[PDB]
Amino acid sequence: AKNVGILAMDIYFPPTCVQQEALEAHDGASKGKYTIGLGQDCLAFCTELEDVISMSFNAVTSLLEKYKIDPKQIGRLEVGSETVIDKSKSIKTFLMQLFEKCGNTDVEGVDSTNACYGGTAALLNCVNWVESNSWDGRYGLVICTDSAVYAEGPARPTGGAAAIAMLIGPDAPIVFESKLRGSHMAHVYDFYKPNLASEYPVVDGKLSQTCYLMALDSCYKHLCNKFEKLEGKEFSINDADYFVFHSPYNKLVQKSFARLLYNDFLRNASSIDEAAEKFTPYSSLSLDESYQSRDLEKVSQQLAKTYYDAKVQPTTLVPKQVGNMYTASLYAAFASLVHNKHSDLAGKRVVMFSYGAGSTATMFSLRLCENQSPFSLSNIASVMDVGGKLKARHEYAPEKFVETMKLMEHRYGAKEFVTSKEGILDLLAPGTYYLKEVDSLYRRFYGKK
Amino acid sequence: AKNVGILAMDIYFPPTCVQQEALEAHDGASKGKYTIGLGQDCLAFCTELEDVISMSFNAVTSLLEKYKIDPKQIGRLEVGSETVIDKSKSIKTFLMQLFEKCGNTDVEGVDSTNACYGGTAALLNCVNWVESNSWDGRYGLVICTDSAVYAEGPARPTGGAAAIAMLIGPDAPIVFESKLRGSHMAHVYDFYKPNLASEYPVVDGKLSQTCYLMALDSCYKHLCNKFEKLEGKEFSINDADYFVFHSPYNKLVQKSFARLLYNDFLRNASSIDEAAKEKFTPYSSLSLDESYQSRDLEKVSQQLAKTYYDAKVQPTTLVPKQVGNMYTASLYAAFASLVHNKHSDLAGKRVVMFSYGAGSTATMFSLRLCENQSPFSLSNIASVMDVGGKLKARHEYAPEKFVETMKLMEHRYGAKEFVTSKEGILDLLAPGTYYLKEVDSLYRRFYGKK
Numbered sequence: 001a002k003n004v005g006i007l008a009m010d011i012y013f014p015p016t017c018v019q020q021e022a023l024e025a026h027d028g029a030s031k032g033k034y035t036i037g038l039g040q041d042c043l044a045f046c047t048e049l050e051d052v053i054s055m056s057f058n059a060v061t062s063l064l065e066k067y068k069i070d071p072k073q074i075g076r077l078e079v080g081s082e083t084v085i086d087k088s089k090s091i092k093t094f095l096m097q098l099f100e101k102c103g104n105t106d107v108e109g110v111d112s113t114n115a116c117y118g119g120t121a122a123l124l125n126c127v128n129w130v131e132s133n134s135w136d137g138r139y140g141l142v143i144c145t146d147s148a149v150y151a152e153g154p155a156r157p158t159g160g161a162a163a164i165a166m167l168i169g170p171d172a173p174i175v176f177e178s179k180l181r182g183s184h185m186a187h188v189y190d191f192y193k194p195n196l197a198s199e200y201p202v203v204d205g206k207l208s209q210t211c212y213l214m215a216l217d218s219c220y221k222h223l224c225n226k227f228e229k230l231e232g233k234e235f236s237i238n239d240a241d242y243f244v245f246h247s248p249y250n251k252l253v254q255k256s257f258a259r260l261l262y263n264d265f266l267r268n269a270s271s272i273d274e275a276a277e278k279f280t281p282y283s284s285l286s287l288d289e290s291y292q293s294r295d296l297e298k299v300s301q302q303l304a305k306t307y308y309d310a311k312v313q314p315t316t317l318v319p320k321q322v323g324n325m326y327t328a329s330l331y332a333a334f335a336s337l338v339h340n341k342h343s344d345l346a347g348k349r350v351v352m353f354s355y356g357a358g359s360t361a362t363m364f365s366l367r368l369c370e371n372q373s374p375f376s377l378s379n380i381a382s383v384m385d386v387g388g389k390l391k392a393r394h395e396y397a398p399e400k401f402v403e404t405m406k407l408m409e410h411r412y413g414a415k416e417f418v419t420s421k422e423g424i425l426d427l428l429a430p431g432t433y434y435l436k437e438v439d440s441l442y443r444r445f446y447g448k449k
Numbered sequence: 450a451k452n453v454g455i456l457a458m459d460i461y462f463p464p465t466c467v468q469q470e471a472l473e474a475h476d477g478a479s480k481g482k483y484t485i486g487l488g489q490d491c492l493a494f495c496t497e498l499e500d501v502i503s504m505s506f507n508a509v510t511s512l513l514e515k516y517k518i519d520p521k522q523i524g525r526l527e528v529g530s531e532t533v534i535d536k537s538k539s540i541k542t543f544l545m546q547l548f549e550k551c552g553n554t555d556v557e558g559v560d561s562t563n564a565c566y567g568g569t570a571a572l573l574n575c576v577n578w579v580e581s582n583s584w585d586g587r588y589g590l591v592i593c594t595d596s597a598v599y600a601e602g603p604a605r606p607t608g609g610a611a612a613i614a615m616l617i618g619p620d621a622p623i624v625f626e627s628k629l630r631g632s633h634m635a636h637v638y639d640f641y642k643p644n645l646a647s648e649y650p651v652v653d654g655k656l657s658q659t660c661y662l663m664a665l666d667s668c669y670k671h672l673c674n675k676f677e678k679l680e681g682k683e684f685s686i687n688d689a690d691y692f693v694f695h696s697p698y699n700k701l702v703q704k705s706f707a708r709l710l711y712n713d714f715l716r717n718a719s720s721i722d723e724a725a726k727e728k729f730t731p732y733s734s735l736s737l738d739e740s741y742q743s744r745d746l747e748k749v750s751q752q753l754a755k756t757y758y759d760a761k762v763q764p765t766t767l768v769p770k771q772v773g774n775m776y777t778a779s780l781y782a783a784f785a786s787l788v789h790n791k792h793s794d795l796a797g798k799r800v801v802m803f804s805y806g807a808g809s810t811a812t813m814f815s816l817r818l819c820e821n822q823s824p825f826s827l828s829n830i831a832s833v834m835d836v837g838g839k840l841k842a843r844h845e846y847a848p849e850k851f852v853e854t855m856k857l858m859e860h861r862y863g864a865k866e867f868v869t870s871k872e873g874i875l876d877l878l879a880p881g882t883y884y885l886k887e888v889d890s891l892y893r894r895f896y897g898k899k
């Protein structure tokens with residue numbers, strides 16, 4: 001029951017994508033408004049053949065296959081998502097047909113839901129299960145699957161789609177520092193899906209950031225106060241090697257980390273260099289006014305950029321090339337950190353921030369240990385093969401991407417149809433699950449390969 | 450963290466209800482088809498003023514006040530439900546407005562969802578938190594809230610509504626027998642909500658039985674197989690004092706337990722006398738697929754289980770027979786009925802619990818009851834819950850006002866920008882209850898209190 005945490009990961013995202021310069025040109029945006037403004041390069045999206053069930057299958061099987069895992073030492077399977085296929089029958093039950101011919105039905109877990117936080121909540125539920133009296137020696141399995149889609153408004157470029165599987169068990173290369181974490185949650189209306197027919201949420205763009213910031217502050221503060229009662233020291237951005245955040249878009253991750261450096265100034269931490277009086281015009285602000293001062297954002301970005309290149313920039317590859325993955329975004333960003341720093345990460349500490357509108361948030365700490373294959377940081381980066389998957393995409397022209405998104409609107413919550421395999425089944429990878437049909441009774445049937 | 454389990458409970462259901470006798474006559478049903486056929490006596494339902502948020506508020510507040518517990522000793526809050534108000538913003542966040550006047554925002558937990566099982570999943574998640582390295586000494590709090598509503602068909606009589614709150618912490622009167630449990634989960638289309646506009650579920654004939662049986666079988670089997678590796682002996686009907694079931698309607702609880710006695714016959718348990726081994730054996734030539742469909746083996750099973758049923762489950766039936774189907778809260782209103790009817794008894798006993806959600810998800814787990822010190826004692830819980838006084842405080846609807854309300858709820862489901870009609874209905878609410886005032890142009894919801 002020791003040092004339980006992530007033993008394995010694998011990632012799946014649709015190979016169908018659009019590129020953002022191409023989408024700046026298509027819509028009416030100044031050049032750089034997506035590439036530099038939002039910090040995004042490529043937008044992955046589900047075609048009519050893929051969904052959160054489909055992507056879940058690809059991520060689950062590929063973790064069990066490549067890590068050579070017996071489906072029968074899965075004691076708990078939990079799914080984090082915000083895409084509603086059915087309002088009563090969970091994604092977890094759909095996933096159970098991977099374990100049907102395996103005889104394994106004594107598995108715990110269901111869906112956890114609140115915006116982009118359910119995946120993290122499931123991960124936390126799962127670790128606490130392994131350290132539970134109810135444990136049975138078997139592996140936990142966590143799924144993060146989402147398709148981020150918006151109306152043709154200014155939020156459509158911030159879309160995405162992906163699925164991530166994580167095997168939870170003891171003596172992990174990725175251990176949880178169980179007590180070093182902090183949560184913040186309130187009742188706020190910054191982003192939510194109240195229109196049950198529509199796959200599109202109402203977004204209160206202003207307040208999305210404002211709420212995200214208040215939570216990131218309170219989470220950091222609570223975390224620092226638990227570091228203080230455990231190891232006697234104050235916590236600072238220099239007491240961690242890498243910071244990885246929920247990544248709805250890149251410019252929000254920039255500001256979020258720069259905001260962590262601002263929080264160090266109001267407590268005068270060892271992380272604030274003396275050349276870094278550049279802040280001091282803003283110490284007359286209350287914390288309510290701090291959130292809205294567009295220069296304090298703009299100032300914090302200036303001295304944190306060198307820190308950002310060292311402690312955040314490796315966490316950016318897949319979010320910058322897939323888009324917003326909701327519950328899975330934070331863990332694709334961590335997957336980017338594994339792929340580009342697997343050879344170094346032994347012994348390091350990585351702090352993780354998860355956010356979901358509503359709102360729910362938690363900042364928690366991982367310390368990485370070197371371990372032994374197949375559950376080793378070096379083998380995870382190999383199995384994820386992030387480089388080859390990014391290398392295996394197909395871009396849509398910006399006008400056919402818009403045509404796909406209008407087909408998805410009519411297929412959402414839709415009855416009685418067969419999916420159109422014309423030409424598209426060709427571009428997904430050999431072995432992937434995909435949606436074949438949904439019958440007159442909304443039942444869904446999937447194929448493979 | 451030690452002897453962790455349920456420390457406190459409180460239950461809320463709407464005071465507006467229908468009696469099923471009155472509704473047999475109204476719906477044009479055979480006499481007895483609801484009271485005896487389904488075993489139900491009274492059906493509670495939400496008016497335009499109440500919903501799962503409202504009911505959650507009532508259950509949470511009433512638990513913290515009546516047990517005098519500080520909101521800043523809540524470390525984790527989880528909600529189990531299947532009523533979708535919003536597809537992204539959880540019920541859990543709505544509950545956080547009870548904690549803002551406290552500054553306590555360092556609470557873990559979100560919504561857990563799968564049919565009538567999400568509440569059990571939350572309870573289990575919460576138990577595993579107190580025993581986790583991540584624990585912080587504070588109480589866990591679990592909510593089960595649902596409004597069970599159907600279109601006007603043969604399932605409308607099986608409606609219900611309630612919310613239940615449970616305080617999780619160590620050294621409890623209701624301890625969890627952590628390793629004595631069994632789960633079963635599969636991909637079935639027996640009951641599900643695929644039409645996102647309607648709050649009504651699709652049901653595929655009697656597939657729940659076929660599924661409910663396979664799950665109740667597999668779960669009981671797995672639990673028995675863990676009893677032998679724990680305590681050497683086989684498990685039987687007699688190695689527990691009370692059996693509590695997911696209670697969508699009463700007649701399913703009868704068969705569910707009667708079906709457990711059949712599973713004891715097929716395992717030669719110490720609970721099967723020769724009068725029962727006789728009556729069962731004409732039926733052991735059946736495959737387990739055919740057993741599911743034998744309308745004769747059922748009724749034989751209910752006959753040989755009647756005295757066991759009268760002793761080990763009938764007290765677990767009070768609230769469900771007088772409220773209706775409460776989905777995620779169904780199992781725990783039944784357990785609340787057991788505490789209310791035998792708090793003077795429940796010290797030392799073993800109580801086995803069965804939970805099901807279509808989809809499907811299932812777990813049978815065991816609780817041992819300890820007499821402990823007030824306020825966290827079985828006798829004070831039954832006092833605080835006061836289910837008897839809550840039931841005496843109902844207001845009965847005539848069967849056509851219940852039907853008029855239920856098509857009004859269809860007009861408010863997923864609807865925006867309206868104000869609710871409090872006149873005459875708010876009269877019926879107890880002093881203290883939360884209620885919905887309006888939903889504005891942005892679907893935002895606003896609640897009031899008496």
Ligand SMILES: CC(=O)SCCNC(=O)CCNC(=O)[C@H](O)C(C)(C)COP(=O)(O)OP(=O)(O)OC[C@H]1O[C@@H](n2cnc3c(N)ncnc32)[C@H](O)[C@@H]1OP(=O)(O)O
Nearest residue numbers: 030031032033036037116154155191205208248355356357
């Ligand atoms: C849990 C979560 O938080 S994820 C789910 C909630 N969040 C979401 O869904 C994303 C919401 N969708 C959105 O589109 C975002 O709200 C927004 C902010 C991009 C709204 O879209 P816009 O109308 O374009 O907003 P805005 O005008 O502020 O543009 C954003 C950025 O691009 C910059 N920008 C604008 N045009 C350009 C340009 N040609 N070149 C470079 N940068 C530009 C702006 O300076 C701004 O950056 P800044 O904050 O550093 O000043």
Ligand SMILES: CC(=O)SCCNC(=O)CCNC(=O)[C@H](O)C(C)(C)COP(=O)(O)OP(=O)(O)OC[C@H]1O[C@@H](n2cnc3c(N)ncnc32)[C@H](O)[C@@H]1OP(=O)(O)O
Nearest residue numbers: 479480481482485486487565603604607640652657697807
């Ligand atoms: C959803 C879950 O998680 S678990 C499954 C629970 N299902 C639900 O919640 C949704 C389904 N809702 C329903 O109401 C179900 O469809 C039903 C079966 C209860 C109702 O459909 P009906 O056609 O009215 O049921 P049916 O005709 O089989 O009669 C029900 C019982 O009452 C008996 N009955 C019929 N008429 C009478 C009468 N006058 N007097 C006494 N008993 C009668 C029947 O013999 C039968 O008893 P039995 O099951 O012991 O053999």
